[PDB]
Write an enzyme that holds these catalytic residues in place. Structure first.
Site, PDB file in Angstrom:
ATOM      1  N   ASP A  85       0.852  -1.179   0.000  1.00  0.00           N
ATOM      2  CA  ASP A  85       0.000   0.000   0.000  1.00  0.00           C
ATOM      3  C   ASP A  85       0.891   1.233   0.000  1.00  0.00           C
ATOM      4  OD1 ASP A  85      -2.078   1.754   0.052  1.00  0.00           O
ATOM      5  OD2 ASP A  85      -2.941   1.071   1.945  1.00  0.00           O
ATOM      6  N   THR A 104       0.425   4.887   0.964  1.00  0.00           N
ATOM      7  CA  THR A 104       0.559   5.767   2.117  1.00  0.00           C
ATOM      8  C   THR A 104       0.546   4.958   3.407  1.00  0.00           C
ATOM      9  OG1 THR A 104      -0.321   7.737   3.213  1.00  0.00           O
ATOM     10  CG2 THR A 104      -1.920   6.176   2.301  1.00  0.00           C
ATOM     11  N   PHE A 126     -14.863  15.238   8.207  1.00  0.00           N
ATOM     12  CA  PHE A 126     -14.209  14.825   6.973  1.00  0.00           C
ATOM     13  C   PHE A 126     -14.502  13.354   6.718  1.00  0.00           C
ATOM     14  CE2 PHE A 126     -10.479  13.050   4.750  1.00  0.00           C
ATOM     15  CZ  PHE A 126     -10.546  13.782   3.583  1.00  0.00           C
ATOM     16  N   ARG A 166       2.060  16.108  -3.483  1.00  0.00           N
ATOM     17  CA  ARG A 166       0.641  15.872  -3.252  1.00  0.00           C
ATOM     18  C   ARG A 166      -0.023  17.202  -2.936  1.00  0.00           C
ATOM     19  NH1 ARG A 166      -2.529  14.005   1.276  1.00  0.00           N
ATOM     20  NH2 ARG A 166      -0.626  13.924   2.549  1.00  0.00           N
ATOM     21  N   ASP A 203      -1.617  -0.265   6.533  1.00  0.00           N
ATOM     22  CA  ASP A 203      -1.704   0.359   7.850  1.00  0.00           C
ATOM     23  C   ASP A 203      -2.762  -0.315   8.717  1.00  0.00           C
ATOM     24  OD1 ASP A 203      -1.496   2.173  10.014  1.00  0.00           O
ATOM     25  OD2 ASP A 203      -0.947   3.781   8.632  1.00  0.00           O
ATOM     26  N   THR A 222      -6.035   0.406   9.560  1.00  0.00           N
ATOM     27  CA  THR A 222      -7.237   1.124   9.971  1.00  0.00           C
ATOM     28  C   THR A 222      -8.141   1.443   8.788  1.00  0.00           C
ATOM     29  OG1 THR A 222      -8.033   2.984  11.298  1.00  0.00           O
ATOM     30  CG2 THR A 222      -6.208   3.417   9.782  1.00  0.00           C
ATOM     31  N   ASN A 223      -7.576   1.595   7.591  1.00  0.00           N
ATOM     32  CA  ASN A 223      -8.389   1.938   6.430  1.00  0.00           C
ATOM     33  C   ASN A 223      -9.143   0.721   5.905  1.00  0.00           C
ATOM     34  OD1 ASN A 223      -9.011   4.386   5.081  1.00  0.00           O
ATOM     35  ND2 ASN A 223      -7.957   3.660   3.237  1.00  0.00           N
ATOM     36  N   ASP A 224      -8.440  -0.395   5.713  1.00  0.00           N
ATOM     37  CA  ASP A 224      -9.018  -1.616   5.151  1.00  0.00           C
ATOM     38  C   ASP A 224      -8.672  -2.783   6.073  1.00  0.00           C
ATOM     39  OD1 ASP A 224      -6.390  -1.236   4.619  1.00  0.00           O
ATOM     40  OD2 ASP A 224      -6.487  -1.746   2.487  1.00  0.00           O
TER      41      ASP A 224
END
Length: 1086
Positions: free
Chosen positions: A474, A476, A569, A621, A796, A798-800
């Site tokens: 991944d 980031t 957000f 970015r 990481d 927490t996202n997936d």
């Protein structure tokens, strides 16, 4: 009649205890004992022996299998009141079968039948006549008004106490004796003690005593190792502490244990080494929780109340309503008291009111702990391969024992004592430590891994990590460390004669700096700290703003600023907006991705699209900033109606210093590494090219035009080439597209191609996926598994979190520092977590992937060598014992004991080894039955039996034995005993030295001294014995003096057998060791 309705249970029958009279191991055996006593009132003693053996086996059988226990001890019944036991057939994916006891107790004038299976309560519902687990109100059908109208528990809550139970983890650590009592009955230990009893019956005293002592020591060590883990699982439970609970319309302090669902609590600032009692849903107030323990993220989220939502219409969705949930085990940093009055009085402390939802093992962390403890699946679930391998050796055993029996009958020996030698051979062929080898290997690998802070939740995934064919990364948080360095503002010049024109700082108009200071999610706690996204902290420090305790942020050298209201957000419609106030008037700022901000403001700049793509193409970015003056609590679509451009934010995300080397090693180690990320394709392609995933030019698949016509356009990073494509009509051309460019696929192009015939041909050649939604990662991993490729995803977490569990092995790389963990370990020593992915790494470095792959490889190869060595040693020992027992000779006590010790000395050292740092291209194959193992074993055994038969022929030529009447095997010094003993002790060491694992996987034999010196010493002793170099040694160990001619034959035969075995093993290893890698892990480009 009786049944159980739960996702765990499959089938169930009631049981009743049977008296000792009708048991199967008491009554049917008295007639046989009476018949034996009558026949007795030589050859008849073996009958009593086998009768006692069968009786003790029938008595021990109920403990091995649960169905045998249910059939022997209990008789099934279909009345629920009378039954005092029940059997539970589990679902094939949850734990294993078991017998659980039914308890009864009278409450409120009615008895309630309940039991406990896997720490999951049950009860007896009279109307349904079926045992059912207690069901919580949240899961089945939540209504957001029901949680508001609740006023807490009142009255006498005895039935609730019975139904839901105490709000605490319940893991009882059993005493050492209770665990050893169970370990003793196990089939392996019983078989080993029976093998020792046989040697006792054969008049071997010191040998059997030493063996029994070693067995007891090993079992004690295993029990200690299990008990230390059972004690480790206990520390995950939170310590009880006092909180205020609403009962009987007044606040009274109760401990954490006495908590039930639908009970009001007041949460305050969590104390040290403490956490939230149980899963709660906020009813009023706000909090800033720290999900580092359950979710594994550093950014503390912001939770809000549920009172603002309407009660009648809406439902509790746990979707958009996820900001109200507080998971158990996390720490609350700051909580605010309720603002307005309510029906219930305010709590005595300034804490926020919340409602309990789930208590005990049924919360998230509790469910994970229960799954880890009970329903865990051990390594090698099938276990058929070990039993088949043992049956192979038993076939060879019978082939040898038939010859032993025939020769013993021919030489006049007694059969009553010959059956004992036959049984000794058959039972000495079978190795006991064979099936339990992979478990010990995996445990050693887990220890070696945990030495590197790579903690492991599920162990059986380790052999999967040995031979991984595709590893998915991944972008980031995994391949890019999150320490952003602000570069400069851009796009603020209205003229903009130069595309790449940057303003460093303290030069933009006041509007831009006011916007970048107003729109942020930072907040300062009462104690004094800064919590938020580190990118925002770095930006805010770079520009020079300062946030105070109150939401007001000022002292930036330009004025005083304050935030009146802020907006959340989210991934969908991604942007952040806030309304601030300046001393002149009031305005409103917004900060979000540029593609979504462009479609909002009215006055579109001329260089917007050009500058955005120009700055996105090389690493940077970008984020957009816009403002609108707002004249004097409202909705979100009004503040963001129209805007005015204010500039860009250019963040240069630097790579981790350990990413390039790990990716190079994974590329050169016969592994394919692809990237799966959610960022825009330009930055993803740039990072993939800088790291080393894609070598040449790259193509990007994306939508052709703004219209949703589902037409994909092949386009380079620049505008050099554009190839049109149609998913419905056209087809992929191999030589034109896949051979040259190594294309990268966007999530939209992956969605539009869903259902195409060449999807599985496309997914073979792409290395970079960008803009994939959190749902399509699961689809990609499932497809890669379906094609036959094992996967390793490291993200990481927490996202997936759902994507990691799909891959064969998943890693979650948290954020931490080496010095921080060193200081923490030092503090823990002086005093004396993710929990969401299979494997966790406390350190942020990327080398955890290489580490875990190497450790899995070493575990597999160690299992292979232990299989080979154990099988060969057992066969050699069996056939040597056969060649001895054919005649009347046999070993003594000292000789067998010295053999055992000299082999244990090598067994100690052979486990030690240091893996080579660099991985190798040869992947070890899994499975016991393959050409390599069977060929090597059979051919080495052929060489060994050739040597043994030749030397036995020579010895029989030297001294001939004549068939005597009624022979009895006894120990006396003779040439046969000497020859066969030296050959046994030299050939076992020869196998230990030949079948040691080669250099490429772990290490060479010479490098580690603990094994080299041990083998040299044992071989030196054996060679001094064979050559008669020290007559004191031969005299002290009862060796007959050998003829001058016979020593030469013995020594040369052993020295030639070693070379033959080495040559054969090297040939088989050179020709059938490593399996071929897949068709995707190749390196080529044109």
């Amino acid at each position: 009649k009786s049944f159980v309705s739960s996702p765990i249970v499959r089938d169930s029958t009631l049981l009743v205890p049977k008296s000792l009279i009708a048991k199967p191991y008491v009554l049917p055996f008295f007639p046989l004992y009476a018949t034996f006593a009558q026949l007795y009132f030589e050859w008849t003693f073996v009958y009593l022996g086998t009768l006692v053996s069968l009786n003790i086996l029938v008595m021990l059988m109920p403990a091995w299998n649960v169905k045998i226990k249910a059939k022997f001890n209990y008789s099934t019944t279909k009345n629920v009141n009378e039954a005092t036991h029940i059997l539970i057939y589990t679902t094939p994916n949850n734990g294993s079968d078991g017998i659980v006891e039914i308890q009864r107790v009278t409450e409120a004038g009615s008895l309630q039948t309940f039991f406990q299976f896997q720490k999951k309560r049950f009860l007896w519902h009279e109307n349904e006549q079926v045992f059912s687990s207690p069901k919580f109100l949240v899961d089945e059908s939540p209504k957001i008004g029901d949680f508001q109208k609740c006023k807490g528990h009142s009255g006498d809550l005895t039935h609730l106490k019975r139904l839901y139970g105490e709000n605490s983890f319940d893991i009882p650590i059993p005493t050492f004796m209770e665990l050893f009592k169970e370990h003793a009955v196990a089939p392996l230990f019983v078989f080993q003690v029976f093998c020792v009893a046989l040697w006792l019956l054969d008049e071997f005293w010191y040998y059997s005593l030493f063996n029994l002592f070693m067995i007891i020591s090993m079992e004690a060590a295993a029990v200690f190792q299990r008990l230390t883990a059972l004690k480790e699982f206990r520390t995950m439970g939170i310590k009880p502490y006092t909180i205020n609970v609403f009962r009987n319309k007044k606040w009274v302090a109760l401990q954490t244990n006495e908590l039930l669902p639908m009970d009001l609590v007041s949460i305050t600032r969590t104390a040290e080494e403490s956490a939230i009692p149980c899963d709660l849903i906020l009813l009023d107030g706000s909090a800033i929780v720290n999900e580092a323990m359950l979710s594994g993220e550093s950014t503390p989220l912001l939770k809000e109340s549920i009172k603002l939502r309407p009660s009648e219409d809406n439902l509790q969705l746990d979707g958009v309503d996820k900001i109200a949930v507080l998971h158990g085990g996390t720490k609350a940093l700051q909580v605010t008291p309720p603002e307005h009055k309510s029906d219930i009085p305010p709590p005595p402390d300034g804490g926020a009111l919340a409602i309990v939802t789930k208590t005990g093992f049924e919360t998230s962390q509790g469910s994970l702990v229960r799954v880890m403890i009970y329903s865990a699946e051990r390594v090698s679930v099938d276990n058929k391969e070990a039993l088949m391998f043992i049956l192979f050796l038993l076939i060879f055993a019978v082939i040898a024992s038939w010859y032993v029996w025939v020769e013993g009958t021919k030489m006049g020996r007694i059969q009553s004592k010959l059956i004992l030698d036959c049984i000794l051979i058959i039972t000495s062929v079978v190795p006991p430590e064979l099936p339990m080898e992979l478990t010990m290997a995996v445990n050693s690998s887990l220890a070696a891994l945990a030495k590197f802070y790579v903690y492991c939740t599920e162990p059986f995934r380790i052999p999967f990590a040995g031979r991984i064919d595709v590893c998915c990364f991944d972008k980031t948080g995994t391949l890019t460390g999150e320490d952003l360095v602000f570069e400069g503002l851009a796009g603020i010049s209205a003229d903009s004669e130069n595309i790449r024109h940057l303003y460093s700082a303290a030069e933009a108009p006041e509007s831009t700096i006011l916007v970048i200071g107003a729109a942020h999610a930072l907040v300062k706690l009462e104690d004094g700290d800064i919590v938020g996204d580190p990118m925002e902290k770095a930006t805010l420090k770079a520009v020079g703003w300062a946030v105070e305790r109150k939401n007001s942020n000022y002292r930036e050298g330009t004025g005083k600023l304050d935030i009146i209201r802020r907006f959340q957000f989210s991934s969908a419609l991604k942007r952040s907006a806030s309304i601030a106030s300046h001393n002149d008037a009031l305005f409103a700022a917004v900060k979000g991705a540029p593609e979504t901000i462009r479609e909002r403001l009215s006055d579109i700049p001329k260089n917007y699209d050009e500058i955005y793509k120009s700055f996105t193409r090389s690493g940077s970015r970008v984020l957009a900033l816009a403002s609108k003056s707002l004249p004097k609590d409202l909705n979100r679509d009004d503040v963001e109606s129209e805007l005015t451009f204010n500039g860009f934010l250019i963040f240069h995300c630097p790579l981790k210093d350990d990413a390039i080397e790990t990716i190079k090693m994974l590329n050169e180690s016969s592994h394919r590494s692809i990237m799966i990320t959610g960022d825009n394709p330009l930055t993803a392609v740039h990072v993939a090219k800088e790291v080393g995933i894609v070598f040449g030019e790259t193509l990007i698949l994306d939508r052709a035009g703004k219209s949703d016509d589902n037409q994909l356009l092949f386009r380079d990073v620049e505008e050099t080439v554009s190839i049109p494509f149609d998913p419905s009509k056209d087809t992929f051309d191999h030589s034109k597209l896949f051979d040259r460019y190594d294309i990268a696929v966007t999530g939209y192009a992956l969605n539009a191609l869903e259902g195409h015939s060449q999807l599985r041909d496309l997914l073979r050649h792409t290395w970079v996926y960008a803009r994939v939604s959190p749902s399509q990662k699961e689809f990609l991993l499932n497809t890669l598994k379906d094609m036959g490729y094992q996967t390793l995803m490291c993200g990481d977490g927490t996202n997936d979190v759902g994507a990691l569990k799909q891959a064969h092995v998943g890693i979650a790389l948290l954020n931490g520092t080496e010095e921080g963990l060193k200081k923490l370990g030092e503090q823990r020593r002086l005093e004396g977590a993710s929990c969401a992915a299979p494997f966790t790494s406390k350190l942020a470095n990327v080398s955890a992937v290489t580490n875990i792959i190497r450790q899995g490889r070493c575990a597999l190869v160690n299992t292979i060598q232990m299989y080979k060595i154990l099988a060969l040693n057992c066969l050699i020992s069996a056939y040597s014992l056969s060649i001895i027992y054919m005649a009347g000779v046999k070993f003594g006590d000292g000789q067998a004991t010295v053999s055992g010790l000299l082999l244990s000395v090598c067994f100690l050292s052979i486990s030690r080894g240091k893996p080579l740092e660099k991985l190798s291209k040869q992947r070890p194959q899994s499975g016991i039955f393959n050409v390599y193992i069977m060929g090597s074993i059979l051919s080495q055994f052929a060489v060994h039996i050739a040597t043994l038969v030749y030397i036995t022929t020579e010895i029989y030529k030297l001294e001939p034995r004549e068939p005597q009447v009624d022979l009895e095997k006894e120990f006396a010094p003779s040439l046969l005993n000497t020859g066969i003993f030296i050959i046994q002790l030299v050939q076992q060491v020869s196998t230990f030295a030949v079948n040691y694992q080669g250099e490429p996987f772990r290490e060479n034999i010479r490098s580690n001294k603990g094994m080299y010196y041990g083998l040299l010493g044992v071989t030196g002793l054996a060679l001094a014995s064979a050559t008669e170099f020290l007559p004191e040694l031969n005299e002290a160990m009862k060796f007959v003096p050998m003829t001058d001619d016979f020593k030469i034959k013995l020594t040369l035969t052993l020295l030639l057998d070693f070379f033959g075995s080495w040559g054969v093993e090297h040939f088989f290893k050179f020709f059938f060791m490593d399996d071929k890698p897949s068709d995707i892990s190749v390196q080529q480009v044109k």
